[PDB]
């Protein structure tokens, strides 16, 4: 009767699990979150889509009637922390290769960035210490923003030239593209130090002398490795097109802006109405108000533009859109140099890059020579309105979590100072493409969502979790 049989036979011996067996989990973990349920609720906050009339999965997100106990990101918080960040901790204990350590430190620093953009605040200094501290302190967002850029710097300065020896499904061991992914996150985290006016001299200094370099990535920074079978698809399509039925219809701010500009990206992810064959977005949080004004039979799903799921089954999860990357440059060219001609061809390259990804290559002329021509852009702020509002389009169906983030920092697109009910009662008032505060709005202060709730799993077991606050209160870098 041997009693020494308590090593679990269902899992490998801990020696045999090496750094190359753990590392691919880090990106897939991060992707399953930020390309899944985070990406999801960010698409509502950025106002790309809206709850379908005849179903009800996401009423609470459209109308901002959710609270901390709704657990609107408790899955993703478990995934990014107990999944990606712990595995990244283990890779960093199991390999000495500076290249692999660089590539994990970026992936790790990306996760903290995403959690900070959600709760402005994240455990960091003391996270991932297990039973030596079950109750991590929650760092202010910029001890960790300055922390993880301090990491990416240090792991970059450790590169000795040797290659990567762990399976890399983002870049395929191409350390050149990790160079550009790290600088690209430097570009986006530097800009927010600026537009939050924290050491705004030093970080404009650095955004000048990192666009200096063009030492960025090529292509898109993604995880494209999905098959349309089971447990292998895009997380967002998986959740919303096999686990649920269709709950997403196109929202009024996006659909009108793209009709306004005669955009042909209008059709990529968005269907004509099943009733009249036109493009109709639903005003934010206006699901229930529209069937009250129009009637039940007259605001079904056939009267609003559905979100086409068919292009998403295998579709990649993006962490950094190329079209976004050059939109960020185009804004530092127009603001911190003043190099109009250079800005113009960063902008034009963000649009051309997007047009190609949606299968409309060769038709960027329809935006680059028309309403959104850089010719008609009078003011400096008129150009940036063009930069930002074509950024906002570029991230639709690509990276919703950033699209909402950058909406808060530049605060363009802006809150149409008109209520949903007015815009309903006469459309001519609404400037196409600016945001409508939800018709039904559960935020006592009114306005647009600025901050996800804190994880209830953190609320319950971690006493040092900041006290819940309404969605109305900005993340540290949103100052306007």
């Amino acid at each position: 009767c041997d009693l020494n049989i308590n090593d679990d036979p269902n899992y490998p011996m801990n020696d045999q699990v090496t750094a190359d067996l753990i590392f691919p989990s880090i990106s897939a973990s991060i992707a399953s979150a930020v390309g899944g349920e985070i990406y999801n609720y960010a698409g509502f906050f950025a106002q790309y889509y809206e709850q379908k009339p005849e179903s009800n999965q996401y009423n609470t997100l459209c109308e901002y009637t959710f609270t901390e106990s709704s657990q609107q990101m408790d899955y993703s918080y478990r995934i990014l922390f107990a999944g990606a960040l712990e595995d990244a901790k283990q890779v960093l204990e199991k390999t000495t290769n500076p290249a692999d350590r660089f590539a994990t430190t970026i992936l790790r620093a990306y996760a903290f960035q995403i959690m900070v953009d959600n709760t402005s605040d994240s455990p960091y200094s003391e996270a991932l210490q297990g039973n030596a501290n079950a109750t991590p302190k929650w760092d202010t967002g910029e001890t960790v923003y300055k922390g993880i850029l301090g990491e990416i710097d240090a792991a970059e300065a450790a590169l000795d030239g040797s290659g990567m020896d762990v399976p890399d499904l983002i870049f395929n061991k191409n350390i050149a593209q990790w160079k550009g992914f790290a600088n690209a996150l430097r570009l986006r985290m530097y800009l927010r130090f600026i537009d939050a006016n924290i050491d705004a001299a030093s970080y404009t200094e650095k955004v000048k002398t990192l666009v200096q370099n063009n030492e960025f990535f090529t292509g898109d920074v993604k995880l494209d490795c999905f098959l349309d079978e089971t447990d292998k698809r895009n997380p967002w399509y998986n959740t919303n097109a096999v686990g649920l039925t269709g709950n997403h219809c196109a929202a009024y701010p996006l659909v009108s802006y793209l009709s306004s500009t005669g955009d042909p990206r209008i059709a990529y992810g968005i269907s004509k109405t099943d009733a009249d064959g036109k493009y109709v977005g639903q005003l934010p949080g206006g699901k229930t108000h529209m069937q009250s004004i129009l009637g039940t039979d007259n605001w079904k799903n056939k009267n609003v533009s559905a979100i086409d799921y068919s292009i998403g089954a295998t579709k990649p999860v993006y962490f950094f859109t190329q079209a976004e990357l050059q939109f960020l440059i185009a804004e530092v060219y127009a603001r911190f140099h003043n190099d109009d001609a250079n800005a113009k061809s960063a902008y034009e390259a963000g649009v051309t890059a997007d047009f190609a990804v949606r299968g409309f290559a060769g038709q960027e002329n329809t935006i680059l020579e028309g309403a959104c021509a850089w010719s008609a852009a009078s003011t400096q702020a008129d150009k940036l309105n063009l930069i930002y509002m074509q950024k906002w389009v570029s991230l639709f169906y690509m990276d919703h979590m950033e699209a909402w983030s950058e909406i808060r920092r530049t605060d363009c697109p802006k809150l149409s100072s008109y209520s949903a009910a007015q815009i309903q009662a006469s459309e001519s008032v609404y400037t196409p493409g600016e945001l409508v505060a939800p018709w039904t709005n559960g935020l006592e202060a009114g306005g647009l969502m600025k901050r996800m709730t804190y994880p209830l799993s953190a609320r319950q077991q971690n006493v040092n979790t900041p006290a819940g606050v309404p969605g109305s209160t900005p993340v540290w870098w949103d100052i306007k």
Binding site: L3, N6, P9, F66, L85, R233, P235, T245
Partner: protein
């Protein structure tokens, strides 16, 4: 026996069997103090919960150890891992015992003297003893042959005032009844097929859901063969049960077969004996859940639709592409005729026991027990997309919102294998010395348990209806699992006895388990009990009134180990659980392992339960009045558990020893015989139970709260350090400092409070049974009531009928616009908080949402009161007079009529379910609630007995 020092009940086979349940425990429901017995559902084959003195294990293992002769008997349970989308329960280890083979059962309720069975006895013991060979007249053949019927016990109470529609307006395709008040006018309904539409008068049909159900039916046959001599005995039995339940078709099916052969032979000082049993079952379950399951699909019918008018699939409007509604539900007849959820089990268990008496006082006993099972699950669903999507309204016409997305078919199969060995080597010594009596018993126990399974699944069926692993063009999924646990122990039990008046018992035991850390495997636990038959020293007359008077007291401990593999770290094949799906490796061609999310420990110490108990037992006048009372105070301490941890620590849970979970209680039995002539007798029985659950501490380092079962962003049931186990938290309406419900200024609907509130616990406040047995000559009449009151339980059945507009509650205010009575508006700019009388109504248009969310209670409304009074069983039995059995081969004949689960009466707040339901199994997490579990049933049957 009955020199015992703690609470114990004994039931005879005749009582066990008289109810004619297929199961051995369910006829005892509500009939024994401290022994809570529920059935998970009236679905044929389902499991049974038996819980002694409340929940002590938070990790879901609270059933008593079953011990058949006395070899511990496997009690595993087979039930759905996912109660929310595919709930089903295929049975419980003990459901295998043939009721007709039971001679006596004796429930040990105390956890203070368990050295004879070790740890698993802290939850109680059900000691069963089987019939042996007996010399009787004439041949030794007993035949039992029964027939039984099922009928629905209680359907939710429906409004019949508003028909098909939404927002208050008529539609032609709703899954609900928020339409207008019935006209008797003619109004189209259903999808349109061949440019034709159905058209019928717009009026209620209040029996549409009731007509849906058939009458359950079940037949049974058991035979036994019996004989003995002065040296040996032999018993062989066979039982058989076939049930097809209340639900239309074969979908609700249970078939049981047992065969047993027990025997002994004595020769000189040595006796050898053996018991070998085979058990076969075949279950079919009509799965529950929130998807396309029968019942969910069935309750989402408008009150004006004729549900039985949907069975004929030769009417095209009932085929899946034209079924009258598209909203996440299907024709219930299609589901039950075309889905597959089936289980088969073969099982062998047996004992070998050898006794050797030597040197006047000693006895050597070797006992070996084996219990091995192989069970096989097979589940299929059709590829609805390939069959029905193109060209149909439901259909291509609904796009991404069709019920057929992405219902592309699925089939899986699992074979599981269990095997338990138990070995007992004991020597017993018994000598009277003067008036004293001494009995000592030292023994060795060894035990080994093993389960394994292998699982395979294919999705996207090429041929849309054939359920085979060949029928997919996509990747298969394969899973495999094994666990192995071992334990040896030494024990000793000294019982002393003076003049048949004082009894004293001392037990000691020390175990070594394989599931504890290597440097801390051994745990020790003693006990002590005392009995004092103080009747034996009363007056000569005063002891003519008191037939019997015993007082008893026990103090003792019971150690316990952990579940398998909770010490070392683990790396899992990396997988990410996202809402309503996964993203798992391999991708794409690469495999990956991830640090597992439950941090393990080598710090763990053994579990230890300490219990004190006093009891009193007295009988009066011929045993014409009798009572037993007991008081217990039990503390399960340091139980090993995966305690929720903040994932930012890098793990979602850590394995540690908890604090104390205490259950204190009163157990009261009271019987009396008002009338006992020689031809007539009337007996009355009243048993009463009150348990007080309190978690005393969960390690505060990790908070003092861990979820037991919960919905993400919804009602969850916890264990919290100051409270009983099973505290629910649910959303409640915000209220201002004077108690009025704050309401949105524009909608009229309640506003959520910032936190969930506490809203009750799972525990009954008390439980009691009242029963009476009439005997006149050879007629008997038994009647037993079961009373459980207190505590709360989640019920999707109420949740869906509120959301549907079918519940009677939703016809409130005759669905005219309304202001929530005593509502206010919160008026707050920045920092100044003020409340104003609410003026906003809730529109006709929005009344559906008000009720869909739960009225002013919000989601806490779907915690229902778990209380009921139930006519548990009635049995009318007639032994035929032996004089009419003389020209017959028959030695005896008894015909019997019985009814079970006959009526249920519940508080007014609950017009929806029989509270005796679940979708999460027969243990702790079962108490969370039912998730549109199938409606419980009313049973009634005959039985014919014949002795030869």
């Amino acid at each position: 026996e009955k020199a015992l020092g703690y609470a114990a009940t004994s039931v005879g086979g005749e009582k066990i069997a008289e109810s004619r349940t297929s199961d051995v425990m369910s006829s005892l429901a509500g009939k024994i103090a401290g022994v809570q017995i529920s059935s998970t559902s009236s679905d044929p084959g389902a499991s049974n919960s038996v819980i002694i003195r409340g929940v002590s294990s938070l990790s879901g293992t609270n059933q008593p150890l079953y011990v058949v002769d006395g070899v511990p008997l496997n009690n595993s349970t087979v039930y759905s891992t996912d109660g929310l989308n595919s709930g089903y329960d295929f049975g419980n280890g003990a459901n295998a015992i043939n009721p007709d083979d039971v001679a006596n059962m004796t429930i040990l309720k105390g956890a203070a003297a368990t050295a004879l069975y070790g740890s698993r006895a802290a939850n109680g013991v059900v000691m069963i003893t089987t019939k042996s060979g007996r010399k009787e007249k004439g041949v030794g053949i007993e035949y039992n042959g029964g027939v039984q019927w099922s009928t629905v016990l209680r359907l939710p109470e429906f409004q019949n005032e508003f028909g098909m529609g939404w927002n208050g307006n008529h539609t032609e395709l709703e899954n609900g009844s928020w339409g207008p008040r019935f006209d008797g006018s003619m109004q189209l309904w259903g999808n349109v097929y061949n440019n034709s539409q159905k058209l019928k008068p717009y009026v209620a049909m209040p029996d549409n859901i009731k007509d849906f159900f058939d009458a359950g039916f079940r037949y049974s046959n058991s035979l036994s063969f019996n004989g003995a001599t002065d040296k040996s005995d032999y018993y062989v039995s066979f039982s058989q049960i076939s049930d097809d339940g209340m639900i239309p078709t074969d979908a609700d099916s249970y078939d049981k077969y047992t065969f047993s052969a027990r025997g002994s032979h004595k020769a000189g000082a040595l006796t050898f004996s053996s018991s070998l049993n085979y058990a076969y079952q075949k279950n079919n379950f009509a799965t529950t859940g929130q998807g396309l399951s029968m019942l969910n699909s069935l309750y989402q019918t408008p009150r004006d639709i004729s549900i039985i008018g949907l069975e004929d699939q030769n009417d095209p409007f009932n085929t899946p592409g034209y079924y009258y509604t598209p909203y996440g539900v299907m024709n219930p007849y299609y589901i039950l005729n075309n889905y597959l959820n089936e289980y088969e089990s073969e099982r062998f268990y047996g004992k070998f026991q050898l006794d050797y008496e030597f040197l006047k006082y000693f006895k050597f006993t070797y006992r070996m027990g084996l219990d091995t099972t192989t069970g096989q699950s097979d589940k299929g669903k059709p590829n609805l997309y390939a069959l029905y999507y193109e060209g149909t309204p439901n259909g291509e016409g609904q796009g991404s919102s069709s019920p057929f997305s992405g219902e592309t078919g699925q089939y899986s199969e699992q074979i599981t294998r269990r095997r338990e060995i138990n070995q007992d080597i004991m020597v017993n010594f018994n000598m009277p010395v003067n008036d004293f009596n001494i009995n000592a018993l030292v023994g060795f126990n060894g035990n080994e348990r093993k389960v394994s399974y292998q699982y395979s699944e294919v999705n996207d069926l090429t041929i849309p209806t054939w359920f085979n692993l060949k029928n997919s063009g996509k990747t298969p999924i394969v899973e495999q699992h094994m666990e192995l646990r071992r334990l040896m122990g030494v024990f000793g039990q000294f019982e002393g006895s003076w003049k048949n008046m004082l009894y004293l018992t001392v037990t000691a035991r020390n175990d070594w388990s394989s599931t504890l850390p290597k440097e801390n495997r051994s745990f020790f636990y003693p006990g002590i009990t005392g009995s004092f038959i103080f009747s034996e020293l009363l007056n000569d007359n005063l002891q003519d009134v008191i037939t019997f008077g015993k007082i008893r007291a026990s103090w003792g401990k019971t150690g316990n180990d952990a579940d398998v593999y909770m010490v070392n770290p683990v790396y899992a094949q990396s997988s990410n659980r996202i809402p309503f799906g996964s993203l798992t490796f391999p991708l794409g061609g690469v495999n990956a392992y991830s640090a597992g999310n439950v941090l393990g420990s080598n710090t763990l110490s053994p579990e230890m339960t300490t219990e004190s108990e006093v009891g009193l037992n007295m009988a009066f006048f011929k045993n014409r009045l009798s009572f037993d009372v007991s008081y217990y105070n039990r503390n399960t301490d340091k139980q090993i558990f995966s305690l929720a941890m903040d994932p930012a620590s890098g793990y979602t849970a850590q394995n540690m020893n908890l604090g104390k979970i205490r259950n204190r209680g009163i157990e009261l039995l009271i019987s009396g015989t008002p009338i006992r002539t020689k031809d007539f007798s009337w007996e009355l029985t009243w048993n009463f139970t009150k348990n007080w659950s309190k978690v005393i501490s969960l390690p505060e380092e990790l908070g003092g709260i861990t979820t037991i079962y919960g919905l993400n962003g919804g009602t969850s049931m916890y264990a919290i350090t100051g409270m009983p186990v099973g505290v629910f938290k649910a959303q409640v309406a915000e209220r201002d400092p004077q108690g009025r419900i704050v309401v949105n200024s524009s909608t009229g609907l309640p506003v959520e409070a910032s936190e969930f509130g506490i809203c009750g616990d799972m525990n009954n406040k008390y439980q009691m049974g009242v029963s009476t047995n009439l005997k006149y000559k050879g007629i008997s009449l038994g009647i037993d009531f079961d009373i459980r009151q207190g505590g709360v339980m989640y019920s999707r059945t109420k949740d869906i009928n509120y959301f549907t507009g079918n519940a009677i509650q939703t016809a409130y205010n005759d669905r005219n616009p309304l202001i929530v009575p005593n509502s206010v508006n919160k008026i707050v700019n920045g920092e100044n908080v003020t409340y104003v009388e609410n003026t906003t109504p809730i529109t006709s248009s929005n009344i559906y949402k008000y009720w869909g969310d739960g009225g002013s209670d919000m989601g806490s409304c779907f915690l229902v009161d778990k209380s009921y009074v139930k006519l548990r069983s009635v049995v009318l039995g007639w032994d035929l007079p032996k004089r009419w059995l003389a020209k017959t081969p028959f030695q005896a004949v008894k015909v019997s009529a019985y009814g079970n689960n006959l009526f249920v009466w519940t508080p007014s707040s609950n017009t929806f379910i029989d509270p005796e339901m679940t979708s999460f199994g027969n243990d702790l997490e079962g108490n969370y609630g039912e998730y549109t579990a199938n409606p419980s049933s009313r049973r009634f049957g005959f039985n014919l007995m014949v002795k030869f």
